[PDB]
From a paper:
Uridine at position 34 of bacterial transfer RNAs is commonly modified to uridine-5-oxyacetic acid (cmo5U) to increase the decoding capacity. The protein [name] is involved in the formation of cmo5U and was annotated as an S-adenosyl-l-methionine-dependent (SAM-dependent) methyltransferase on the basis of its sequence homology to other SAM-containing enzymes. Mutations in the cmoB and [name] genes result in accumulation of ho5U and mo5U, respectively, indicating that CmoB is involved in the modification of ho5U to mo5U and that [name] is involved in the modification of mo5U to cmo5U. We have determined the structure of [name] [name], a putative methyltransferase that is involved in the post-transcriptional modification of U34 in a number of bacterial tRNAs.
Author numbering:
A (entry chain B): 20 to 244
B (entry chain A): 19 to 247
Amino acid sequence: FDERVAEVFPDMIQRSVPGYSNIISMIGMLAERFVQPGTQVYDLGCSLGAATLSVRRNIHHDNCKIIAIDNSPAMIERCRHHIDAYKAPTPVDVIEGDIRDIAIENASMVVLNFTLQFLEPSERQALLDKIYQGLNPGGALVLSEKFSFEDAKVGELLFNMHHDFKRANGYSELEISQKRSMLENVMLTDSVETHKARLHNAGFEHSELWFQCFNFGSLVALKAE
Amino acid sequence: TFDERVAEVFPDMIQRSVPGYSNIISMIGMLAERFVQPGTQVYDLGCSLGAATLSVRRNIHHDNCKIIAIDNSPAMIERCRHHIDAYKAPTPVDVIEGDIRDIAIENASMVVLNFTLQFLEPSERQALLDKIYQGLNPGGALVLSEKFSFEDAKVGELLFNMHHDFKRANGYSELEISQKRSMLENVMLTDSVETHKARLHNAGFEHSELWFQCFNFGSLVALKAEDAA
Ligand SMILES: Nc1ncnc2c1ncn2[C@@H]1O[C@H](C[S@+](CC[C@H]([NH3+])C(=O)[O-])CC(=O)[O-])[C@@H](O)[C@H]1O
Ligand SMILES: Nc1ncnc2c1ncn2[C@@H]1O[C@H](C[S@+](CC[C@H]([NH3+])C(=O)[O-])CC(=O)[O-])[C@@H](O)[C@H]1O
C-alpha cells in the first residue's frame, strides 16, 4: 500500500487536488526571487520531490542546498531516485524522518505543500513556530492545504465543485481512489482564518492566500527583513 | 481604433496578462451546470467577446433559459455577436450594446462579473451589486472576478512582482497593445478582498467567499439564500 500510493502519486494528486500543478509552478517563481546564495530550502513532507524539483530548477545561485523530508520509506526511496534523474547545481538532502523532529536552519524558503493536515491539529502550532524561527529574515513559507469553511453553505458548494472536478478527471479510474476518499473523510482540515491565526501566532508579520481553487489553496507567509 | 485593436487581440491579451483566467472560465461553466435553473436568465455583465457567456451556455442542459450579454464597447459587441452565432446551442443569447449601470436584472439564476466591476467608478459599484442581489432569484449565484489590491503592502508588493514575472514569462510585451493597456490598467482603481466581501454583504448576499485566486487576481462567489424574499 505505501508503495502503491507512491507508484501512482502524481496521477492521484493531479486527479484529486484542484490547482496542484499551478501551485508547484508558483513555488518555482517564488524560489527564483527568494532563494539567497548560501542558504537552504526545506521541503517538508516531500513525497516524490515535486516541490523540491520546482525550487531546484529555479535556483541559479551558488552554494545552496534543498533539504527534503518525508517519514514514508516508500516515498523517500522513490524521491531519492527521482531527484537523481535530474541534473542541477543545487544538491538535495533527502532524509527519511519526522518533520516534527527536524531542525530548520538558515532557510530562505520553507514549503509545506499539502502536508500540515497530516499532523494532529494540536501539533500544528509548534511546527510553524519552528519554521518561523528557522527562517532567515526576508524568508518565505508556502502553506498549501485543503480548507474547511465556517459557512456551511459555501462549504457544501465547494465540496460539490471538488466532487465534480474528480468526476471530470476520471478519479474513480484509480484503484487507490476508494482508500483515498476514505482518508479525506477522516482528515482534520482547518479554515483559512485558522491557518492565518496560527501563522501570526508563529511570529509571521505577513501572510496571505496567494492561490485558491474551490476548497484547496495556498498561503504565503513572509518573515520581515 | 484602439477599441477595435483591443477586441481583435483580446483573447491573447487576457491570456498573457490575467493569471488564472482560463481556470476561472472553466469554473464558471462548472457553477452554471449546478446553478442555472430551467426557465431562467443568466447575465454576463461586461461580456467582451462572450467568453463567460459561451462557458455558461455549454453547461446549460435545461430548456427555456436565456443568456443576456452586455458590453458598452461597440467593437466588443460586434465581434461577440458574431462569436456567439458561430457555435450551435439551444439556449439563445441577447447580445446588447449598453451600460451595465442602466440594465435591469430580472429572473436571474446566475450573474457574472468576470473582470468588469473594476471598470466602474468605485462610487458606482455598490449600486450595481445591490441591483444584482435584488434581481437574482432565491438560490442564485454571482461570480465576481477582479484584480485585487492588498491591505498588507508587503504582500501587495510581492504579488505585484509575481504578476510582473508572469507577464514576462508569457511574452506580454510582444503585443503592440501592451504598453497602452498596461497604463489603462494602472488607472482603474482595484479593491481588496475585504472591500469586495463588505460590498457583497451590504448588497444583501447571505453567503460569499473567494473561490479562486492566483497571485493578485481572483474570484468571489456570492449566493442568495433559498428562503430569501
Ligand atoms: N509527520 C510527518 N513527517 C514527515 N512526512 C510526513 C508526516 N506526515 C505525513 N507526511 C508525508 O507528507 C506527504 C503528504 S503529500 C505531500 C505532497 C508533496 N509535498 C508535493 O508537493 O507533491 C500530499 C497528500 O498525500 O495529500 C506524504 O508523502 C507523507 O508521507
Ligand atoms: N459600464 C459598462 N457597461 C458595460 N460594459 C462595460 C462597462 N465598463 C466596461 N465595460 C466592458 O467590460 C469589459 C471588461 S473585460 C471583461 C472580460 C469578460 N467578462 C471575459 O470574461 O472574457 C476585462 C478587461 O478588459 O480587462 C470590456 O469588454 C469593457 O468594454
